Design a protein around this ligand. Structure first.
Ligand SMILES: *[C@@H]1O[C@H](CO[C@@H]2O[C@@H](C)[C@@H](O)[C@@H](O)[C@@H]2O)[C@@H](O[C@@H]2O[C@H](CO)[C@@H](O[C@H]3O[C@H](CO)[C@@H](O)[C@H](O)[C@@H]3O)[C@H](O)[C@H]2NC(C)=O)[C@H](O)[C@H]1NC(C)=O
Ligand SMILES: *[C@@H]1O[C@H](CO)[C@@H](O[C@@H]2O[C@H](CO)[C@@H](O)[C@H](O)[C@H]2NC(C)=O)[C@H](O)[C@H]1NC(C)=O
Ligand SMILES: *[C@@H]1O[C@H](CO)[C@@H](O[C@@H]2O[C@H](CO)[C@@H](O)[C@H](O)[C@H]2NC(C)=O)[C@H](O)[C@H]1NC(C)=O
Ligand SMILES: *[C@@H]1O[C@H](CO)[C@@H](O)[C@H](O)[C@H]1NC(C)=O
Ligand SMILES: *[C@@H]1O[C@H](CO)[C@@H](O)[C@H](O)[C@H]1NC(C)=O
Ligand SMILES: N[C@@H](Cn1ccc(=O)c(O)c1)C(=O)O
Ligand SMILES: [Zn+2]
Ligand SMILES: [Zn+2]
Ligand SMILES: [Zn+2]
Length: 446
């Protein structure tokens, strides 16, 4: 969502999000670092192709044609420069000139040193408490985004980790149709479609980058939770990692984990969908967690088996029509977990990524809330690892990522919503070590 420089009436009125970098002659002189060679302000490139019929409300939702309902001029940086103002480097590059190559390694959380485990956890909690230096977050839709006077932007500061939650919520929220209207729910800009894996990849990349700037530790990397153990229990659910069960309320996190102190954001859906407002930075309840806890559906009371990862990784097509949660022989739909691990669709089956979510039977098992549980990071870095193994084995075959008629938000050239600057699914559909500056220390079945 948007840089605090662009959360102004001037930027919103002119639809131009092109903040200065180093304005030495005065304001406006170095938009996108044009004075240096770093980039230029220019038109926003948005997807123009058709989406599936499932969404009938074109013209009504600000996530259509993202980000054009807010801005149509943005930064484009040259070469390997990057950033909302071209002030940083593309993933994998560092140095003032973005010419020094960088590669970090994401390891299994359970292989980290006791000092690195403590570090990761203190880093997360610091993320949860630290104001995000760049991004501010909308509380109203674009109709209302400049306040009743048209001069008060409807934005709040938000923490580094609450922004990670908020974007995920904003990618998934119902489309508001009007007070007394039933908000429209057959849309998902980050799930149930091919953009799933690329959306969550960029989601995790942005957190990692943010936590690197927060810690001032360029080599900081996100660990992963290997959940394909077929375990009855959640082996990262201990007071030195993520937190174990609270002995006083079995659905809460142990008071001897700092994650028992976290307060979630974005759980007031009925406010959002009846008033036409957005999730803001006011937190409320505590995390709920209850691994293997949903007695009603035994299918989600055990984590994915190792052979699930093995099997989904032999599904050789990235996706298949209708490019939705009912797609068969789709690796994307399989690892997401609406298909069984062989690729066979079943409306009754939940597997791999979705099974891991529902196994927590709590905040992490609800789509609008789940990043509130920090297991989400590790659940999703492991997912991105699986993805990144698939990109390795099938030579990053993007030919199956459909250029048109996917669910709205999931066509290849769609700017993943609501990431800023605009970034398409294509820019993520690359092998991580040589294109994104990170790699996974990880061993697969056979
Ligand atoms: C890119 O955006 C420009 C600014 O529009 C803003 O951004 C959009 C994303 C959207 O959010 C919109 O609601 C925002 O206002 C657009 O430039 C504007 O274009 C107007 C005409 O198309 C223009 O107007 C002028 O002329 C009429 C005369 O009939 C007057 O009524 C008016 O007062 C203005 O003088 C307006 O000035 C102009 N803004 C500029 C140039 O900064 C631009 O069209 C748009 N391009 C796209 C979407 O392709
Ligand atoms: C942030 O979101 C919360 C929750 O959606 C808003 O709090 C609600 O405010 C309305 C009107 O005052 C009431 O229903 C309650 O007081 C709140 N709801 C709940 C569930 O607590 C809050 O006002 C929002 N912040 C802004 C600036 O709009
Ligand atoms: C966690 O699991 C519990 C039960 O195992 C869920 O609670 C049941 O949900 C059904 C809906 O299918 C309700 O009809 C029952 O009344 C609930 N019973 C009990 C005892 O809770 C609960 O919804 C799950 N929560 C999450 C977040 O997954
Ligand atoms: C966020 O914090 C600033 C100070 O950094 C505060 O003055 C302001 O009210 C907030 N700005 C926005 C855009 O929310
Ligand atoms: C997938 O869902 C769409 C619409 O819900 C439908 O066209 C298609 O038949 C579904 N796939 C099935 C039922 O296997
Ligand atoms: N609702 C999904 C499971 N799920 C839960 C929470 C999520 O964040 C997510 O991405 C998926 C399902 O129906 O299986
Ligand atoms: Zn350009
Ligand atoms: Zn998600
Ligand atoms: Zn998920």
């Amino acid at each position: 969502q948007f840089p605090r420089q662009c959360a102004t009436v001037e930027a919103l009125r002119s639809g131009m999000c092109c903040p200065d970098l180093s304005p030495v002659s005065g304001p406006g002189t170095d938009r996108c670092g044009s004075s240096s060679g770093r980039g230029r302000c220019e038109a926003v490139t948005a997807d123009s192709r058709p989406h599936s019929p499932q969404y009938p409300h074109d013209g009504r939702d600000d996530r259509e044609v993202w980000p054009l309902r807010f801005f149509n001029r943005t930064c484009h940086c040259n070469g390997n420069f990057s950033g909302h103002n071209c002030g940083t480097c593309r993933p994998g590059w560092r140095g003032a000139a973005c010419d020094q190559r960088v590669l970090i390694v994401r390891r299994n959380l359970l292989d980290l040193s006791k000092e690195e485990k403590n570090h990761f956890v203190r880093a997360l909690d610091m993320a949860k408490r630290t104001t995000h230096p760049l991004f501010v977050i909308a509380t109203r839709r674009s109709e209302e985004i400049l306040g009743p006077d048209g001069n008060t932007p409807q934005f709040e500061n938000i923490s580094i980790y609450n922004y990670f939650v908020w974007t995920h919520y904003y990618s998934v929220k119902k489309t508001f149709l009007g007070v007394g209207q039933e908000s429209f729910g057959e849309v998902d800009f980050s799930h149930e479609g091919p953009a799933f894996l690329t959306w969550h990849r960029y989601h995790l990349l942005r957190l990692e980058k943010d936590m690197q700037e927060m810690l001032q530790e360029p080599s900081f990397s996100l660990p992963y939770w290997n959940f394909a153990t077929g375990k009855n229990v959640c082996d990262i659910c201990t007071d030195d990692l993520m937190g174990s069960r609270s002995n006083f309320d079995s659905t809460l996190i142990s008071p001897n984990s700092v994650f028992s102190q976290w307060r979630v954001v974005c759980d007031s859906l009925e406010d959002y969908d009846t008033l036409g407002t957005l999730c803001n930075s006011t937190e409320d309840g505590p995390i709920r967690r209850n691994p293997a806890g949903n007695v009603a559906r035994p299918m989600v009371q055990r984590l994915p088996e190792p052979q699930d990862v093995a099997q989904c990784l032999e599904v050789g097509l990235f996706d298949t029509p209708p490019f939705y949660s009912n797609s068969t022989n789709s690796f994307r739909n399989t690892v997401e977990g609406y298909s069984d691990p062989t690729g066979k669709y079943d409306p009754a089956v939940r597997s791999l990524h979705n099974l891991a979510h529902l196994f927590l039977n709590g905040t992490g098992g609800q789509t609008h809330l789940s990043p509130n549980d920090p297991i989400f990071v590790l659940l999703h870095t492991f997912t991105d690892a699986v993805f990144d193994e698939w990109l390795r084995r099938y030579n990053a075959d993007i030919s199956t990522f459909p250029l048109e008629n996917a669910p709205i938000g999931h066509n290849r050239q769609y700017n993943m919503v609501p990431f800023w600057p605009p970034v398409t699914n294509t820019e993520m559909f690359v092998t991580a070590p040589d294109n994104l500056g990170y790699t996974y220390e990880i061993q697969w079945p056979s």
